[PDB]
Design a protein around this ligand. Structure first.
Ligand SMILES: Nc1ncnc2c1ncn2[C@@H]1O[C@H](CSCC[C@H](N)C(=O)O)[C@@H](O)[C@H]1O
Ligand code: SF4
Ligand SMILES: [Br-]
Length: 341
């Protein structure tokens, strides 16, 4: 079971040739699927009708069915629910900014890591998504952006799931989107975020694609971090930071750290000072994310005054840091809120 979106251009050429179809048809299919954002094969008028039928039967265009869309009152954040072929659901979020248009993509149905503040983790892991199911979210978002006068410019792997527990499929998505005859999507426009699977940071450092790396940290010591991120028991904070230092050494590229701020948990002045010591000298940037509400929510968000003080401490120690209030809270589309209904 493959969809069109699972294949590189070369793989599609070889699949067509095995069926006696000219290899040149592969570039035409990529043009119509990715530049024209075709909704179905019958939209690809350049292809013979019989070939459109063979493709529809043997190589379905997309593996996702859109079910529902909701947007914020200002229309700048749009969340879509999709159904998979096996009857599961995932969500995507499309964000309109002044100078860019970004899709937040899911990489798994659920998540196995179980971070204590994340609603996705509360559902557990159903299965990894295929590369085609990730590409499908990007194509749908690019089509929706075009309706708003926009071209999709950026992708963030910050929806449901842990990308480094689905590493091969995530990198296949990057490769397919990079195809010049398809979406022609530069790797620098894609951010991959991880809760901190050390060996895959080392692997990412050696990939030919210059994706941006984000690491979800949330605490500056092991005792605290393990209470929030169960993966820290397996890949502890010292090993995680060492891997980030090696990544910068190999690539010369900045690491972005995410730090969710939680009232009375990880938001003290002493926590900020310890974080600055932990990150000393590293080429990095810290995004401070005030906790978003979830149904369970034993935890709360700190005051504005506490959030601003934490940011002030980091900056004073030479660590670039920005508070980022998530978009889409009013439609349950913010970081940590995706439950797929
Ligand atoms: N309730 C919540 N409020 C704010 N951010 C949250 C949140 N729940 C999870 N997040 C954050 O949402 C981001 C993307 S989660 C998806 C990517 C990856 N699994 C990761 O953890 O990095 C992470 O930085 C995560 O810690
Ligand atoms: S924060 Fe990231 S790793 Fe943690 S449970 Fe949510 S999706 Fe999974
Ligand atoms: Br043909």
């Amino acid at each position: 079971p493959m969809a069109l979106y699972d294949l590189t251009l070369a793989e599609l050429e070889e699949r067509l040739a095995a069926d006696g179809v000219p290899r040149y048809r592969a570039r035409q299919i990529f043009h119509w699927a990715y530049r024209q954002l075709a909704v179905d094969y019958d939209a690809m008028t350049v292809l013979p009708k019989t070939l459109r039928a063979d493709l529809a039967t043997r190589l379905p265009l997309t593996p996702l069915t859109p079910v529902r869309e909701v947007q914020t009152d200002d229309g700048e954040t749009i969340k879509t629910l999709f159904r998979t072929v096996d009857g599961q659901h995932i969500e995507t979020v499309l964000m309109f900014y002044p100078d860019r248009t970004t899709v937040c993509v899911s990489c798994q149905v659920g998540c196995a890591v179980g971070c204590s503040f994340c609603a996705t983790g509360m559902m557990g892991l159903t299965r990894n998504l295929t590369a085609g199911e990730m590409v499908a979210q990007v194509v749908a978002a690019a089509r929706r952006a075009r309706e708003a006068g926009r071209t999709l410019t950026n992708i963030v792997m910050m929806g449901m799931g842990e990308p480094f527990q689905n590493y091969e499929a995530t990198m296949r998505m990057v490769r397919i989107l990079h195809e010049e005859e398809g979406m022609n999507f530069g790797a620098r426009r894609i951010t991959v975020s991880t809760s901190g699977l050390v060996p895959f940071i080392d692997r990412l450092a050696r990939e030919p694609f210059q994706v941006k790396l984000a690491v979800s940290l949330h605490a500056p010591n092991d005792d605290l971090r393990s209470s929030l991120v169960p993966l820290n028991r397996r890949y502890p904070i010292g090993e995680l930071i060492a891997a980030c230092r090696r990544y910068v050494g190999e690539t010369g590229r900045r690491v972005t750290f995410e730090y969710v701020l939680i009232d009375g948990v990880n938001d003290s002045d002493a926590n900020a000072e310890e974080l600055a010591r932990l990150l000393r000298g590293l080429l990095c940037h810290v995004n401070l994310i005030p906790l978003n509400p979830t149904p369970a929510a034993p935890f709360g968000r700190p005051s504005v005054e506490r959030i601003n003080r934490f940011e002030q401490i980091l900056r004073a120690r030479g660590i670039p840091a920005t508070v980022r209030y998530s978009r889409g809270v009013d439609i349950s589309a913010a970081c940590g809120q995706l439950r797929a209904e």
